[model samples]
Target: EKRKAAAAILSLGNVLNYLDRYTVAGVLLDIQQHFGVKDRGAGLLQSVFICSFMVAAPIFGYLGDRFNRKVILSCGIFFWSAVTFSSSFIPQQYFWLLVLSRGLVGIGEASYSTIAPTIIGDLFTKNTRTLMLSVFYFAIPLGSGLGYITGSSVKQAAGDWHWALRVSPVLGMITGTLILILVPATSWLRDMKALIRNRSYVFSSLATSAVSFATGALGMWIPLYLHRAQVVQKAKDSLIFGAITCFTGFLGVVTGAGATRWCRLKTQRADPLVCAVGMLGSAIFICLIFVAAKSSIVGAYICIFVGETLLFSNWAITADILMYVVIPTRRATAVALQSFTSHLLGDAGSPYLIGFISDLIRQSTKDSPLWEFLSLGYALMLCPFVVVLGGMFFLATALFFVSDRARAEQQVNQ
Candidate 1:
């Protein structure tokens, strides 16, 4: 009962974590206009945050392994909230301050993310862990959708970007307080050498990083892409996109969890295999988006819905594999390492890289009538290829999953 309660609270934090993180996505154009920057400059906002996350994850992961995790998490929550609150008050001319605050938000998120899954892992058995994680991760799309919805609606109503930024800080502070009052603290440390040597964990983390690369770029640019494509009116684009993402993302995670559970009943290697199939399917559907969107707006949305569902299905299974294949003492460190490598190689630069490529394409094709549409579309093509690579990595991990899991189980039983 305590574990379940803690999971629920942590899940709430997860929701706010994403909600606060993604609020900026919905207002990228407004920020760009207000700050007087180009596409690459706007992309830098997210890049800095991701870069900060990549750098801080290892530190928090190290602390989570040796210190009282609850304390570390509580401090993180407070720091992020304070920074977020301060960001709302920064003048438009001082955009650099906003960037610094976003980086601080990454620090807070790193602390929470590094430790939260390990807490859930410690609380549940192998049989229940995936489902628990599914419930926990369900917040990713849900919160992100809410962020878009909230950011768009608030900005529309208030006619300013700052107001939208204000919402998360208050909620984050409240959630942080709840965590301090409710979640228990525990500590353990393990050798970094042992964690680095785990073959399955290393492969799985690499696959996750690849997936992050695709998702990060897609998430940052999709709203702007829709607006630039003229698929919907600028006024309604973010709201419409948020609604679709929320519905499809929720459906995808649930469907993936159900499929993962079914597969688990049939074979020990099911987890990685399920992720592998999902990534491959996602890659195919994502590639079709360019073709679909070029013809009909409705078709484009349909592709996004189906493709995102497949992409999200891997969330729970990937986290489950990481926790189960690693021993308890090293799980937090494992998660932190995963976050570090995944973001560093994945999202930390994907947004900036995609923007840079799109700008380059736009410059070279200035004479073309459809330069705006083609540049963004071609740049986004990079995502599906990276996702396919991720699928292959997951397939490789499946080969070693059974042996790694058995060894971990044997260690636990002893």
Candidate 2:
């Protein structure tokens, strides 16, 4: 029940975290015009969230290893919840302040992510870790989809963006209170000094970071591409894109978990192979989206759905690997390291880079705003494919170097 409680708390945080991130996707156009910023600037605004998050992740992860996981997790929730609520009060009248507020929310959120999984690790044995991680992922779809709904709903009702920002924090506060009551504090972080040198952890971290960075870049910019380039001009398109992003990604999660279960029965570390396949599939689908955005209408939506499905499914493979290598004592630090590497290299700057490229293209082709955004899609295309290839190569290498029986034995020793 305690594990369940911890899962519930982490699940809520996942949702809230995505809610804060995706809200910008819904309101990008308004924000761009309101702030007199171009697409690059808007992308930078979005990147600020991950940049702050990336900076704080490792520090907080280390702190959780040294302190109480439960308390650290709670404080993170409280900090982000307050920031979420205060997001409503941020006078959009001052544009920089609004950007700063979003960055603060990112900083606050950094703690929740670093602490929650460690608590989950403490509650569950090694064998159950992957399943627990999958359950925690329920928040990804729920929060992302709800972010669009929540922001759009509030915008419709109150005719103001501030109200949309305010709603998430309110939900977060109620969830945070419940977490404090139901989840007991945990203090079982690993000795980071030793775990940092584990070769499996290092390689897995790098491989996962590559996959994560590609997905993060695509996730941040894809909706904007759909809106600006695809001729879906309705305000409700935000909800539509949000729904597709969350729903299709949900399919990926299910497919990944199911595939991992089947593959694991056949061989050890089979999850990595599953992940590589998903990445490869994602690259193909994303290319289809590129062509669709460039050529036809029907192809665009088809590619969008398939690309999302493949992108999110990668989580299952990565989580399975982490569970295989990390023990209860080091779970928090391990998870934090994963987050740190992925966000720092993969997520933190990709959106901004996308936006920057778009702006550069827009500048050259002043009359073609549509082509400007499409250029970002084209530029990002190579990165995702590279990530897919990297994952496949790593999985094959790992299989040869580390035997399944050896891995199982290592876990037992830990």
Candidate 3:
């Protein structure tokens, strides 16, 4: 009963974490118009948030390993919730304040993101860990979908973006309070040197970071890209994209979890291997979307659905690999390290990078009538190729996974 309660609360927190993050993506156009900023400036919002998140994650990770995790989690929940609420009240003219508030929210999310999974790692083991993680991470797309739908719907109904930002804070505060009440406390610390030396953990983290790079770019830009392509109305694009993201993400994670279970019966390296296969599949589908984007809207959306599903297939499996390969005392630190490295190299710059590339192309092709659409499309072409790179890293991890798992088991037995 306690385990179920904790998982439920943690999952709810995960949902709110992503929901709040992506809400701004859904309404970027409105924000851009209100602030009179170009695409690069707007993309900087996500960049700043990810930068703050990466900076804060390691600190929280160190603390989470040494202190009571539930307390850290509760404080993080309240901090982000409070910051998110404060953001809705920022005046349009004080756009910098809004940006600063989002950065502060990143600190709060970093606390939870680094610690929550360790809590789950402590709660379950082996195949059960993978299953529970799928349940936890399942919140990513669901919350993201809700963020898109809720943000868009609220903007339509209230005729303002601020109101859309207000909804998550309420849910966040309530969930934060429940986490404080339901989740148990833990105190386990492991040496940083030991964690850094784990071969499988190191490679897997880098591989996942590569995946993060692609996802960060696509998640923020897809809605705008679709709208620019004239495939969907500006007002309705987020809703449609959210629906597809939610459906594909759920299907992919569930499918991946099932595949992992089946493959585990065959070999110890199934976890990383599954991730490699999923990323490779994602790469293929993404390339298809790149081609289909120009010729057929329906074909592009179909590719997006398949590509996203394949992309998400590794969500749970990779986390499972981290927990099992690293020692229990250091799992929080492992997650923190993963978050720091991943975000620093991944989403922290992908959004801004893609936006900058688009701006550059736009400037060069200013004479063309389709410059805006063409530039954005060309900018996104980077995602699929980066995803292929990520798959290669995962494949490397597969080679080391068996030995790493064996080493950890020997350490535990000793």
Candidate 4:
């Protein structure tokens, strides 16, 4: 019972980790207006945060394997909460301070995200392991989903956007305290050599980056895009978007697990294959969403519902793939390195890349709503193509999945 509760608190931390990250996204437009930044500038907020997050993940991965993890996690939360609290108080003129604070927050979360999963992985193995991990990974989208919900709701409740950012830090402070009281804590060099040599892990991580690229760009941009479409209430639209993501993320992950289970009966390579199918189908629905956006507002959400669900179904399976291919001793490092690569190649730049492309497209036209929607939509259009590329990466992972998995089993059996 105590160990079970331990996992629960860790999930709560995950809720906070991603929760704090995406709160900025929830109130992005106001942050943009308050600071008078362009789309690229707004995108910079997430870029800076993720850039820091990606860098710190590998370091934390390294540290967690070698030192006192509970203490590291506790300190990180203390730092994260403090930076978040102070960041809210920054003046409008000091946008750079806000940026710096978010980077600091990313550094804080890196400790939690990288180390927490390693501990959880240690707690269980086999079928229960998959279930535990499913529960664990669920918190990501749950926290992110709630991050958007809570951030926007808080903004509305407080009558100012900054409070959305301000009110969140203390909860983290409490959770940090809980971590020290509640959970246990817990990686290395030849590990790197082995990981690099593991073709399946390498392919899966590359595939993961592709998903990160598309999801990061989509999550940050979709609210603004929908608002521009029929000119919906920015508030209500953001709320709806948040709600949909929460539901879709839940549905997608459950579906991924179920699908993988059934397919496993047919072939040992089920994990990556299932992930590939989901991505390819999701790419289709995502493309349809853009096509629908050109016409009816109602039409686009239909595809959003379908597209988002299909795309998200791949999330949990990706992690399961990692566990399958990497040995227990080095799994934490593998997790951290995968996170580093995903962010470095994926989300760390996707939001900025999408915004840059959108702005670049906007330059050709002086001023027009038609162009505004089209250009932004055009930038997002690249997401589907990238999603297709991600699907291909998963397919590549399938090719090597059996061999790498058997090798890990060999190491573990010894």
Candidate 5:
């Protein structure tokens, strides 16, 4: 009963996580129009959230490890939701304040992320971990879709983007309070000693962080690319992207989880193989995104759909494998490290770097169509792909050290 309750609370956090981050994408046009922001400037505004998240992730991770994860999580969600609600009141004239509010949301989300996955780990065993993690991820597509739908639909009807942004906070606050009242503080939170010495935990943190960086950057920028850089119009891009993300992307998650589970049933070491194949496939799809974006809209969508499928699958496998190798007490700290590295390398700097590059080109060319802003930003995405692929390679290498043990265990099970 406790496990079920905890899973429900954590799942809700995942939903709120996706909602807070994705709402910005649906309202991009309104935000741009109101703030008089260029594509580059809009990117910078989004980066503010990532920046806050990256900076605060380690702090929250440590807090979770040292204190009551349940309380930390509740406080984190409550603060961020309040910030989200407060954001609606920030006048369009106060662009900086709006950015600051989003940054605060990031801070809240960072704390939630650092603690929630660890709680999920405590609630499940090794065999069921991947599936449970997949369940947690279901919130990503659904929350993002709703955020896009709400922001776009409201903007279309009443032209009140502020209200669109403000309304979700009520849901967030209610959920946070429920978590505080219901979830028990786990013993793992009181035991942080062994996590520090775990080798698998360290490597997984680095590798997962690499994956997070790449995926996080993609989520933050993709909508802006379609709407602003491609000039595809706001609502159309949101609907199309949201649909692809929820429908096709959801399939990818299922396929990845199913594939891993099947492989595990066949052999203990199957996850690394699944991850390797998924990473290599994802790399090809990402390259295709660049190609299709240059060539045709239909092609870009096709490539993005395929790429997301592979990417999400690879991530599921990577995470599943990592959890298997680490002790329960270390899971939150391990996840926190993953968040830290991901932000440090993946999300924290990508937006600012991409925006700065886009701005430089725009200023140099006086915002000419000759050098499309999206094209330039899309090119920078290749760097993170390389990082993700590299991390996969590292994980594969590390898997070898454990393969003998995995095989021995497999034989025992057999």
Candidate 6:
């Protein structure tokens, strides 16, 4: 029960972190209008946020491996909450200030994402750990979907996008206090060397980077793309896409855990194996989303639902694999180091990169809804291709998972 209480408090901080980050996302249309960011600036905001998030992970990784984990969570929430609160204060003339401040928001995420799973790893093992992680991972979408519902709801309610940015961000301080009182502090370095050589860890991290890429691009563009593509007839306010992304995760986390739990009893390689299937299936489903765009609006929505259900499937098992294969002491450093590469390779600019492609396509021709759909739709196609490579990384991991895990078991004995 003590451990489960720790998980609840730790999970509480996660939802807030994702909640604050996506508040920018959920409120994206207004931010674009307020700043007149056009094409380049919106991607820049998300891109800059990710870069700092990438850079800060390793430092926290080093700290949590050796220091009090609770305080790290405390400080990060405080920083994220305050900066988000501060961004609401900037004027329209200072677009760069808003951009820079939001980048600080991602840094705050680094501290949480890099360290949270490590503590959760210490508390449980095997299938129970899998369920615990599935729940914690679900917090991401719970906060994510809620951000969409609340962020826009708040914006509409206030008539000010800036107000959207600050909506009770005081929760930052509230959440920090929760962590300080609630989650436990925990313990690293020859261990660092061991992490790199672990094939399961390397392959799984790279596979997740692929997910990071697909997810990053899908979040920003799909809603806007749908808006323009369906300039033919309908939708969203963006609420539909937000709600879809949010809901698919519900199916994703639970199904993957059950699939893996059952598969594990059948074979030790079940985690990565199930993940490979999800990645490959999501890639094909994503491709179908673009394919469907040409004919039926309903098909597009249906495919996104299918694409994301499979995409969300990756979350639980990816963390579960890392927990099983890495020792407790080095897990923080391992997670941070892995995240550095994943973000560097994944979202660091997948958001911006797709934006660049879409803009370049737009520049190539005189504008029309034809090219708007032509340009944006085609660039979005890049994600499915990357997702295929991610699945291959998982396939690669499956080959090596059994051996790497056995080695991890040996580490604890020493």
TM-score of each: 0.92, 0.85, 0.92, 0.91, 0.81, 0.92
Residue 171 lDDT, candidate 1, scale 0-100 = 86
lDDT of 4: 0.82
| Residue 163 CA displacement from its true place in model 2, Å | 1.2
Tens-digit lDDT string for candidate 5 (194-258): 54444544555555555665666576666656544455321587677777777765887798888
Candidate maximizing lDDT: 3
- Could you tell me which 10 consecutive residues in candidate 4 have the lowest summed lDDT? 226-235
Lowest-scoring 10 consecutive residues by lDDT in candidate 1? 226-235
Candidate 6 regions off by >4 Å?
35-39, 185-192, 232-235, 297-300, 359-368
Q: Give the poorly placed runs of model 4, Cα more than 4 Å off.
A: 33-41, 91-94, 185-187, 231-234, 297-300, 363-367
Per-model C-alpha RMSD: 2.7, 3.7, 2.7, 2.7, 4.9, 2.4
lDDT tens digits by residue: candidate 1, 1-414: 777778888899889888888887678788999989887778678878888888889889888888788888878988988888889888968988888888888877898888888888877876677778988888888987898899888876898888888878898899999998887654233467787678889889989999889888887787667666663322686688788888888898888888887887898888899888899999999987767756654665578888899998787788888987998878888999888888878877687799899988888855453567778988999999899999999988999998998999899788
Minimum summed lDDT over a 10-residue window in model 6 is located at 232-241
Q: Name the regions of candidate 1 deviating beyond 4 angstroms.
A: 35-41, 186-190, 223-234, 297-300, 359-366
Question: How many steric overlaps are in each model, in order?
Answer: 0, 2, 0, 1, 1, 0
- Summed over model 2, clashes come to 2
Q: lDDT (0-100) at residue 48 of candidate 5?
A: 80
Model 2 poorest ten-residue lDDT run: 400-409
Ranking by lDDT: 3, 1, 6, 4, 2, 5
lDDT of 2: 0.70
Worst 10 residues of 5 by lDDT: 226-235
lDDT of 6: 0.83
